[PDB]
Amino acid sequence: RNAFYRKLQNFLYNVLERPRGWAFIYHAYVFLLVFSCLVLSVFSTIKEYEKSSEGALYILEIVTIVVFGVEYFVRIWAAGCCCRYRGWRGRLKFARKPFCVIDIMVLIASIAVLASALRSLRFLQILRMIRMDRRGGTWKLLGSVVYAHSKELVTAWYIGFLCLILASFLVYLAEKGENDHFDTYADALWWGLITLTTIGYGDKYPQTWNGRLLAATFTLIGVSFFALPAGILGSGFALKVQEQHRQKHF
Amino acid sequence: RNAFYRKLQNFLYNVLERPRGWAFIYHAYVFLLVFSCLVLSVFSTIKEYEKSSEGALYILEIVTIVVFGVEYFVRIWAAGCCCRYRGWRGRLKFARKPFCVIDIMVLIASIAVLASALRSLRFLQILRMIRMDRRGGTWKLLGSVVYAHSKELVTAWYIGFLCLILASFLVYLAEKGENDHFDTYADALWWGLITLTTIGYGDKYPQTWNGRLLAATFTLIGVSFFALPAGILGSGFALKVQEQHRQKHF
Amino acid sequence: RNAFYRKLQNFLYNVLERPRGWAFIYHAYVFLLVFSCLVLSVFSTIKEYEKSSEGALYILEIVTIVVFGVEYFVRIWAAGCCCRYRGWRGRLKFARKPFCVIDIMVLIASIAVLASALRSLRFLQILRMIRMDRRGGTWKLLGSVVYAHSKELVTAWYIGFLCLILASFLVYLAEKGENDHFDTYADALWWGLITLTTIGYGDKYPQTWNGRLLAATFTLIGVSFFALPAGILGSGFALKVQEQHRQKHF
Amino acid sequence: RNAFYRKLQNFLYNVLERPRGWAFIYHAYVFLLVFSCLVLSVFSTIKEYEKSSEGALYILEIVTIVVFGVEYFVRIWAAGCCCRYRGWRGRLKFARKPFCVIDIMVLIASIAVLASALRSLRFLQILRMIRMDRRGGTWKLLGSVVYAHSKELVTAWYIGFLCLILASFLVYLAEKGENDHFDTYADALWWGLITLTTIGYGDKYPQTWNGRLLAATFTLIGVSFFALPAGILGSGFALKVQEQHRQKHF
Ligand SMILES: O=C(Nc1ccc(Cl)nc1)c1ccc(F)cc1
Ligand SMILES: O=C(Nc1ccc(Cl)nc1)c1ccc(F)cc1
Ligand SMILES: O=C(Nc1ccc(Cl)nc1)c1ccc(F)cc1
Ligand SMILES: O=C(Nc1ccc(Cl)nc1)c1ccc(F)cc1
């Protein structure tokens, strides 16, 4: 009973908090809730499919406030499951943390939402997605790998930037008179930035033997430069996972 | 004779089943059969080259039913080559497997095809390609590598998703009045999704100093994010092959 | 004298053949010769800059025949520098090799060129570039790495192909009536092939809530698939160089 | 006092020179200075936002000359902090170095700037960015990794070049009569170069069953080739960082 009380409350604290194998499905269903809320709002903006989504958004929005408020109250009530928190001093200081402050704030503000309307709704819908990473796991991992590869990321971005400036200047001089697309150094930088990242919208391209002959050399070099950090961080991630797996192997 | 009987039937079971060096050419020729069937159907849809491909499709389609039905009957008759199957109980339970059920089903349904016409033909032509992976080798390998890299794939897709939402919102506010392309948050999400994946169709691009100045920062960051998992899985594959080769080295 | 004779002839054989540090500059200058020949022909096709390049192409073309014929005669005369070739039997059998046959053939045919005109010139200009890899070093290395990664390349291309077929079919059904771009399954395959490779010409894009909602899921998945083998072979190359460097370290 | 003199002057030499943890913020603020100068010039070219940036560019330009001249004088005065330089002979020979020559030259020339106007300003603004890498760290690291991967970079670029030539020739023959886009071998090379790098502006695409059927094979092969070196250098960087970290681990 009361023994089941303590064991239950602890279990609740662990599912709501760090889950290992089974509570993750629960979190996945809450995430699918907020996700469909986001997609339905995106649908609800365009006035051709407006009336066919408002009512659904009302019901699902309230269901979001329901489940999040219930989660939060359990986040507080089930705080004394670890050694630290208990009574009112440990719980009080716990809510003083940054996450629980910002959480309770946004919860009340959401009630104000159901109380700059659609725009602020877009804002809150963005914010609820950040809730899905409580412990800051993704951010912490990304920052780790980026830091260890600081010098190589910087050489990739620095030399890529030099190549963008030089290529855009040269193609500017080559086609300024002949081509309408290039008229300012602003447009030559736009083309160069949207060509070395391999997007290539297609609205500005060299149209001169001088322009095409210059872009032909600088694409082969620059495109690789601007695609380096995707590869450096990719192989950084993969190597780190291999090392961690080895240490599991001991 | 009968000794050659057992040795033959076993050999048939191994070529039709897991081949090592020589039967793989046989499978490659059956695959080229179904492949040219698929390409010829793709040609046969456009009514300018219609009559010049129907007869070929008829002959080649029947040849497909011929060779697949013959393969399947040998798949059953040559099942008793391993220790398990023999007589009628091991063979019976073997056909109870999922693959042989779905195979025999689709074989009879194909006979019904030669008995929603062209559309269902497109459907079956898709399905026969899935037949080319009997043991589920490709799927099994891909699932292995993805699982071991679960945390890094999720951080790549999660942070990329945050960058897509924020960049699309900001560029929306920046160019909503000035640019026709952006009119709803649906179009800002479309541009953002088709720009950070570096496709860049070119139908929606920022056309404002505010828009271009915002997209210029967010491409440099986001494009890398959306191109991470290609690199993480790439180096995951390559590392796994190096480890397996080492263990061959012992 | 004659001692200098043998030492010279051997040296010639080594520079014309496998060079290590100093003859490579010589080969680089011959390559720049043929390269500028190729670029000048590309210029010479367009009839606005026709007369300003014909004479240069004549002089440089003959200089190419000069240096290549001289190289080839030394390739034969200096064959007896290793242990095998000497006199007339070793030299005779050496010219029987495939490379020297095709080389002498193309040399005489080039003289026939100076004796389907511009088109065949395009053909020969392509061929002379293949001459730049005598020992087949690049091809041999590429084939090595591809073979060791056979299984992962095949899973990347196979699953990417499945994703292309399924995505193109679905977007076809979604926008066939609404969008002009998609009219046949041939055009849906064209869009799908030119979208998952992240080229994105921009001439065919989904223009329907159903189309865009289907393409939005399948790009995130497929684009990674079609960009896998670039990454798998990239990390295969890099790993192989690290191993070879280690064995230099012993 | 004088002891504080020597300790100070040495400290100045180390912050202006190789900084470790704290002076790097100082350098970051000087870099943000020159960066905003570059962006403001890019704004100042377009005559719609001309008058709203000239005065800012004047003030910030002079501030650049102020801080750089002050840095340089301290670069000389604080040269005797290491063992070598002192008095007038070590300092004299130090300024004889290439960097300090080019630095003092560009400093005086900048004063001449405040004394081909806007174009030369674009030129100097480019040059000041190269100042941000004094020790040539980025260039040295990039050259290291490229050299160790010389053979694989060359096979990637060589075989990619062969694929570009062959694909452009074939698609030329396939669509020369039917498609306006392709009219010369120059345009077929332009399309091929701007398609295998996955830019895809969209101004030249095959529009013929023969053209599309040829491009469909060659994209799958070539696109990977032209995206190899980004991946090879990516995994080269990542591997080198793992080795260096291990040797820190000893
Ligand atoms: O938790 C919430 N937002 C949040 C924001 C930032 C961070 Cl860092 N963590 C969490 C939240 C809960 C219920 C609700 F209706 C709305 C928002
Ligand atoms: O085997 C066949 N389809 C299949 C489908 C799914 C799975 Cl998982 N395995 C196999 C098949 C054989 C002959 C034929 F005419 C048509 C289809
Ligand atoms: O060597 C030549 N072509 C070649 C072709 C294929 C292979 Cl595999 N190796 C070499 C060559 C030499 C002189 C010349 F004028 C024209 C061609
Ligand atoms: O140092 C400067 N330029 C430079 C150029 C090339 C190299 Cl390699 N190193 C440095 C510099 C200092 C003050 C100034 F107002 C303008 C330029």
mmCIF file of C-alpha atoms in Angstrom, chain B:
data_model
loop_
_atom_site.group_PDB
_atom_site.id
_atom_site.type_symbol
_atom_site.label_atom_id
_atom_site.label_comp_id
_atom_site.label_asym_id
_atom_site.label_seq_id
_atom_site.Cartn_x
_atom_site.Cartn_y
_atom_site.Cartn_z
ATOM 1 C CA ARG B 1 21.981 -42.165 -60.120
ATOM 2 C CA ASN B 2 19.869 -41.861 -56.985
ATOM 3 C CA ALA B 3 23.093 -40.746 -55.317
ATOM 4 C CA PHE B 4 23.357 -38.242 -58.148
ATOM 5 C CA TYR B 5 19.677 -37.645 -57.405
ATOM 6 C CA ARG B 6 20.325 -36.484 -53.846
ATOM 7 C CA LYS B 7 23.472 -34.581 -54.806
ATOM 8 C CA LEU B 8 21.641 -32.848 -57.645
ATOM 9 C CA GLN B 9 18.566 -31.909 -55.618
ATOM 10 C CA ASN B 10 20.828 -30.515 -52.905
ATOM 11 C CA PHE B 11 22.759 -28.498 -55.483
ATOM 12 C CA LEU B 12 19.528 -27.080 -56.882
ATOM 13 C CA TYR B 13 18.529 -26.100 -53.359
ATOM 14 C CA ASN B 14 21.797 -24.233 -52.893
ATOM 15 C CA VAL B 15 21.754 -22.324 -56.190
ATOM 16 C CA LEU B 16 18.104 -21.348 -55.869
ATOM 17 C CA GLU B 17 18.939 -20.600 -52.224
ATOM 18 C CA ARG B 18 22.135 -19.027 -50.855
ATOM 19 C CA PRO B 19 24.593 -18.956 -53.769
ATOM 20 C CA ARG B 20 28.275 -18.101 -53.296
ATOM 21 C CA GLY B 21 30.173 -17.568 -56.550
ATOM 22 C CA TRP B 22 28.524 -19.066 -59.624
ATOM 23 C CA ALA B 23 24.755 -19.138 -59.174
ATOM 24 C CA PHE B 24 24.840 -15.386 -58.587
ATOM 25 C CA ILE B 25 25.171 -14.908 -62.343
ATOM 26 C CA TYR B 26 21.963 -16.900 -62.747
ATOM 27 C CA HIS B 27 20.151 -14.622 -60.326
ATOM 28 C CA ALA B 28 21.633 -11.617 -62.113
ATOM 29 C CA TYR B 29 20.061 -12.756 -65.373
ATOM 30 C CA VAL B 30 16.645 -13.231 -63.796
ATOM 31 C CA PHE B 31 16.994 -9.754 -62.323
ATOM 32 C CA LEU B 32 17.856 -8.291 -65.713
ATOM 33 C CA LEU B 33 14.719 -10.002 -66.981
ATOM 34 C CA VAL B 34 12.420 -8.325 -64.475
ATOM 35 C CA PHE B 35 14.341 -5.058 -64.805
ATOM 36 C CA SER B 36 13.799 -4.791 -68.552
ATOM 37 C CA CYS B 37 10.177 -5.710 -67.920
ATOM 38 C CA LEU B 38 9.903 -2.701 -65.614
ATOM 39 C CA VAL B 39 11.627 -0.343 -68.053
ATOM 40 C CA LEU B 40 9.511 -1.587 -70.943
ATOM 41 C CA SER B 41 6.325 -0.953 -68.998
ATOM 42 C CA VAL B 42 7.542 2.569 -68.235
ATOM 43 C CA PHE B 43 7.984 3.028 -71.973
ATOM 44 C CA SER B 44 4.629 1.433 -72.717
ATOM 45 C CA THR B 45 2.647 4.038 -70.785
ATOM 46 C CA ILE B 46 3.381 6.999 -73.065
ATOM 47 C CA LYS B 47 1.054 6.714 -76.044
ATOM 48 C CA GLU B 48 3.671 7.809 -78.563
ATOM 49 C CA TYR B 49 5.681 4.585 -78.127
ATOM 50 C CA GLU B 50 2.713 2.393 -77.259
ATOM 51 C CA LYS B 51 2.341 -0.076 -80.119
ATOM 52 C CA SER B 52 6.094 -0.580 -80.350
ATOM 53 C CA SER B 53 6.256 -2.228 -76.921
ATOM 54 C CA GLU B 54 3.027 -4.147 -76.233
ATOM 55 C CA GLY B 55 4.027 -7.365 -77.991
ATOM 56 C CA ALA B 56 7.439 -7.386 -76.341
ATOM 57 C CA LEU B 57 5.754 -6.884 -72.977
ATOM 58 C CA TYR B 58 3.429 -9.821 -73.645
ATOM 59 C CA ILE B 59 6.229 -12.242 -74.513
ATOM 60 C CA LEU B 60 8.497 -11.081 -71.690
ATOM 61 C CA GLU B 61 5.672 -11.093 -69.160
ATOM 62 C CA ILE B 62 4.847 -14.725 -69.875
ATOM 63 C CA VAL B 63 8.534 -15.614 -69.737
ATOM 64 C CA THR B 64 8.566 -14.078 -66.267
ATOM 65 C CA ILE B 65 5.666 -16.266 -65.141
ATOM 66 C CA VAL B 66 7.417 -19.262 -66.697
ATOM 67 C CA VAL B 67 10.731 -18.863 -64.918
ATOM 68 C CA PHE B 68 9.246 -17.808 -61.585
ATOM 69 C CA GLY B 69 6.763 -20.669 -61.431
ATOM 70 C CA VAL B 70 9.521 -23.111 -62.351
ATOM 71 C CA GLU B 71 11.768 -21.616 -59.669
ATOM 72 C CA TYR B 72 8.999 -21.904 -57.090
ATOM 73 C CA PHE B 73 8.181 -25.538 -57.805
ATOM 74 C CA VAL B 74 11.865 -26.319 -57.446
ATOM 75 C CA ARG B 75 11.866 -24.233 -54.247
ATOM 76 C CA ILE B 76 9.385 -26.737 -52.838
ATOM 77 C CA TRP B 77 10.572 -29.978 -54.435
ATOM 78 C CA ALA B 78 14.175 -29.254 -53.420
ATOM 79 C CA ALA B 79 13.316 -28.320 -49.831
ATOM 80 C CA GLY B 80 14.446 -31.632 -48.320
ATOM 81 C CA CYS B 81 18.119 -30.953 -49.033
ATOM 82 C CA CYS B 82 18.831 -29.682 -45.531
ATOM 83 C CA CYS B 83 18.310 -31.868 -42.473
ATOM 84 C CA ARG B 84 14.834 -30.618 -41.559
ATOM 85 C CA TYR B 85 12.454 -30.976 -44.477
ATOM 86 C CA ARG B 86 11.366 -34.259 -46.038
ATOM 87 C CA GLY B 87 8.295 -36.243 -46.969
ATOM 88 C CA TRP B 88 5.231 -34.067 -46.460
ATOM 89 C CA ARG B 89 5.314 -32.653 -42.909
ATOM 90 C CA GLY B 90 8.553 -30.692 -43.199
ATOM 91 C CA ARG B 91 7.610 -29.484 -46.670
ATOM 92 C CA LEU B 92 4.095 -28.601 -45.529
ATOM 93 C CA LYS B 93 5.331 -26.554 -42.586
ATOM 94 C CA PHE B 94 7.940 -24.914 -44.817
ATOM 95 C CA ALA B 95 5.361 -23.549 -47.226
ATOM 96 C CA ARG B 96 3.634 -22.176 -44.125
ATOM 97 C CA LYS B 97 6.443 -19.614 -43.922
ATOM 98 C CA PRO B 98 5.515 -16.025 -44.796
ATOM 99 C CA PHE B 99 7.696 -15.686 -47.891
ATOM 100 C CA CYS B 100 6.467 -18.820 -49.642
ATOM 101 C CA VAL B 101 2.854 -17.902 -48.864
ATOM 102 C CA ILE B 102 3.209 -14.434 -50.364
ATOM 103 C CA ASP B 103 5.190 -15.862 -53.280
ATOM 104 C CA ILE B 104 2.603 -18.466 -54.268
ATOM 105 C CA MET B 105 -0.150 -15.900 -53.788
ATOM 106 C CA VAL B 106 1.494 -13.401 -56.127
ATOM 107 C CA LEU B 107 2.242 -16.157 -58.635
ATOM 108 C CA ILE B 108 -1.418 -17.104 -58.950
ATOM 109 C CA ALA B 109 -2.429 -13.443 -59.006
ATOM 110 C CA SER B 110 0.001 -12.903 -61.877
ATOM 111 C CA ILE B 111 -1.765 -15.682 -63.764
ATOM 112 C CA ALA B 112 -4.911 -13.694 -63.030
ATOM 113 C CA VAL B 113 -3.118 -10.734 -64.613
ATOM 114 C CA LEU B 114 -2.706 -12.689 -67.829
ATOM 115 C CA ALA B 115 -6.224 -14.050 -67.308
ATOM 116 C CA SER B 116 -6.883 -0.777 -62.349
ATOM 117 C CA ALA B 117 -5.360 -2.875 -65.122
ATOM 118 C CA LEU B 118 -2.228 -0.883 -65.908
ATOM 119 C CA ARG B 119 -2.171 0.624 -62.411
ATOM 120 C CA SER B 120 -2.246 -2.810 -60.803
ATOM 121 C CA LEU B 121 0.438 -3.868 -63.273
ATOM 122 C CA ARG B 122 2.574 -1.036 -61.923
ATOM 123 C CA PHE B 123 1.829 -2.444 -58.480
ATOM 124 C CA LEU B 124 2.898 -6.008 -59.290
ATOM 125 C CA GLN B 125 5.976 -4.816 -61.157
ATOM 126 C CA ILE B 126 7.018 -3.013 -57.989
ATOM 127 C CA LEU B 127 6.411 -6.164 -55.958
ATOM 128 C CA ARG B 128 8.518 -8.479 -58.114
ATOM 129 C CA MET B 129 11.515 -6.273 -57.357
ATOM 130 C CA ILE B 130 11.079 -7.033 -53.656
ATOM 131 C CA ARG B 131 11.369 -10.707 -54.556
ATOM 132 C CA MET B 132 14.999 -10.106 -55.487
ATOM 133 C CA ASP B 133 15.918 -9.968 -51.781
ATOM 134 C CA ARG B 134 14.800 -13.325 -50.417
ATOM 135 C CA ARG B 135 16.781 -13.532 -47.193
ATOM 136 C CA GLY B 136 16.191 -9.882 -46.356
ATOM 137 C CA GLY B 137 19.899 -9.163 -46.480
ATOM 138 C CA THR B 138 19.763 -5.504 -47.445
ATOM 139 C CA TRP B 139 17.006 -4.653 -44.980
ATOM 140 C CA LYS B 140 18.751 -6.495 -42.157
ATOM 141 C CA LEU B 141 22.057 -4.724 -42.718
ATOM 142 C CA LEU B 142 20.464 -1.284 -42.979
ATOM 143 C CA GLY B 143 18.495 -1.814 -39.787
ATOM 144 C CA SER B 144 21.614 -2.944 -37.962
ATOM 145 C CA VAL B 145 23.614 0.163 -38.780
ATOM 146 C CA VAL B 146 20.714 2.542 -38.172
ATOM 147 C CA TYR B 147 20.049 1.124 -34.720
ATOM 148 C CA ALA B 148 23.641 1.373 -33.558
ATOM 149 C CA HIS B 149 23.577 5.031 -34.635
ATOM 150 C CA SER B 150 20.150 5.802 -33.186
ATOM 151 C CA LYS B 151 21.208 8.683 -30.958
ATOM 152 C CA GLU B 152 23.185 10.542 -33.623
ATOM 153 C CA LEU B 153 20.565 10.121 -36.332
ATOM 154 C CA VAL B 154 17.997 11.539 -33.928
ATOM 155 C CA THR B 155 20.084 14.558 -33.009
ATOM 156 C CA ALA B 156 20.743 15.251 -36.691
ATOM 157 C CA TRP B 157 17.076 15.079 -37.652
ATOM 158 C CA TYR B 158 15.855 16.844 -34.518
ATOM 159 C CA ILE B 159 18.164 19.841 -34.707
ATOM 160 C CA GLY B 160 17.665 20.015 -38.452
ATOM 161 C CA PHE B 161 13.932 20.146 -37.855
ATOM 162 C CA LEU B 162 14.310 22.997 -35.374
ATOM 163 C CA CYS B 163 16.416 24.888 -37.904
ATOM 164 C CA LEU B 164 13.813 24.329 -40.618
ATOM 165 C CA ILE B 165 11.004 25.670 -38.437
ATOM 166 C CA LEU B 166 12.887 28.724 -37.244
ATOM 167 C CA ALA B 167 14.296 29.646 -40.650
ATOM 168 C CA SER B 168 10.955 29.239 -42.399
ATOM 169 C CA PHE B 169 9.160 31.348 -39.809
ATOM 170 C CA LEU B 170 11.703 34.169 -39.958
ATOM 171 C CA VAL B 171 11.836 34.309 -43.746
ATOM 172 C CA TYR B 172 8.038 34.285 -43.737
ATOM 173 C CA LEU B 173 7.826 37.415 -41.603
ATOM 174 C CA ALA B 174 10.600 39.025 -43.631
ATOM 175 C CA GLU B 175 9.029 38.624 -47.078
ATOM 176 C CA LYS B 176 5.296 38.016 -46.622
ATOM 177 C CA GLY B 177 4.206 41.386 -48.004
ATOM 178 C CA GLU B 178 6.994 41.896 -50.553
ATOM 179 C CA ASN B 179 7.164 38.419 -52.127
ATOM 180 C CA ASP B 180 4.359 36.542 -53.873
ATOM 181 C CA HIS B 181 6.093 33.174 -53.499
ATOM 182 C CA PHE B 182 5.653 33.261 -49.730
ATOM 183 C CA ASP B 183 2.006 33.750 -48.891
ATOM 184 C CA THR B 184 1.318 31.191 -46.176
ATOM 185 C CA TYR B 185 3.330 29.391 -43.559
ATOM 186 C CA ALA B 186 2.771 26.361 -45.771
ATOM 187 C CA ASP B 187 4.854 27.912 -48.532
ATOM 188 C CA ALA B 188 7.565 29.022 -46.126
ATOM 189 C CA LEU B 189 7.834 25.453 -44.898
ATOM 190 C CA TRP B 190 7.943 24.189 -48.479
ATOM 191 C CA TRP B 191 10.771 26.527 -49.429
ATOM 192 C CA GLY B 192 12.650 25.730 -46.250
ATOM 193 C CA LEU B 193 12.325 21.997 -46.736
ATOM 194 C CA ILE B 194 13.349 22.141 -50.387
ATOM 195 C CA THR B 195 16.288 24.454 -49.658
ATOM 196 C CA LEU B 196 17.936 22.805 -46.687
ATOM 197 C CA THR B 197 17.931 19.462 -48.473
ATOM 198 C CA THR B 198 19.854 21.304 -51.213
ATOM 199 C CA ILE B 199 17.331 20.467 -53.898
ATOM 200 C CA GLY B 200 16.416 24.011 -54.703
ATOM 201 C CA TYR B 201 13.761 23.686 -57.359
ATOM 202 C CA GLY B 202 13.869 27.444 -57.728
ATOM 203 C CA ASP B 203 10.184 28.329 -57.602
ATOM 204 C CA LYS B 204 10.353 30.042 -54.191
ATOM 205 C CA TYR B 205 13.362 32.116 -53.194
ATOM 206 C CA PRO B 206 13.797 35.110 -50.901
ATOM 207 C CA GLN B 207 13.656 38.401 -52.798
ATOM 208 C CA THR B 208 14.291 40.944 -50.059
ATOM 209 C CA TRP B 209 17.345 42.207 -48.222
ATOM 210 C CA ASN B 210 15.783 40.897 -45.032
ATOM 211 C CA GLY B 211 14.918 37.556 -46.585
ATOM 212 C CA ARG B 212 18.263 37.040 -48.266
ATOM 213 C CA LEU B 213 20.177 38.110 -45.170
ATOM 214 C CA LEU B 214 18.269 35.592 -43.055
ATOM 215 C CA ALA B 215 18.523 32.738 -45.543
ATOM 216 C CA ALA B 216 22.250 33.386 -45.916
ATOM 217 C CA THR B 217 22.959 32.515 -42.290
ATOM 218 C CA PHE B 218 20.523 29.649 -42.045
ATOM 219 C CA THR B 219 21.687 27.850 -45.188
ATOM 220 C CA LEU B 220 25.272 27.650 -43.957
ATOM 221 C CA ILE B 221 24.058 26.062 -40.732
ATOM 222 C CA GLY B 222 21.007 24.088 -41.788
ATOM 223 C CA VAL B 223 22.292 22.539 -45.003
ATOM 224 C CA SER B 224 24.967 20.769 -42.995
ATOM 225 C CA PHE B 225 22.380 19.526 -40.513
ATOM 226 C CA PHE B 226 20.141 18.030 -43.179
ATOM 227 C CA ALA B 227 23.140 16.363 -44.837
ATOM 228 C CA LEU B 228 24.451 14.804 -41.626
ATOM 229 C CA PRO B 229 22.729 11.392 -41.587
ATOM 230 C CA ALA B 230 23.952 10.583 -45.083
ATOM 231 C CA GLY B 231 27.463 11.015 -43.726
ATOM 232 C CA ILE B 232 26.884 9.342 -40.366
ATOM 233 C CA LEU B 233 25.465 6.221 -41.983
ATOM 234 C CA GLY B 234 28.161 6.352 -44.640
ATOM 235 C CA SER B 235 30.951 6.227 -42.099
ATOM 236 C CA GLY B 236 28.986 3.701 -40.063
ATOM 237 C CA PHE B 237 28.938 1.328 -43.017
ATOM 238 C CA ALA B 238 32.617 1.854 -43.769
ATOM 239 C CA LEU B 239 33.709 1.334 -40.174
ATOM 240 C CA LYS B 240 31.673 -1.844 -39.821
ATOM 241 C CA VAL B 241 33.290 -3.276 -42.927
ATOM 242 C CA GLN B 242 36.732 -2.478 -41.563
ATOM 243 C CA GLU B 243 35.982 -4.256 -38.283
ATOM 244 C CA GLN B 244 34.589 -7.321 -40.025
ATOM 245 C CA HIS B 245 37.641 -7.451 -42.265
ATOM 246 C CA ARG B 246 39.905 -7.262 -39.222
ATOM 247 C CA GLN B 247 38.148 -10.204 -37.575
ATOM 248 C CA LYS B 248 38.740 -12.096 -40.800
ATOM 249 C CA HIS B 249 42.361 -11.123 -40.159
ATOM 250 C CA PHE B 250 41.770 -12.327 -36.573
#
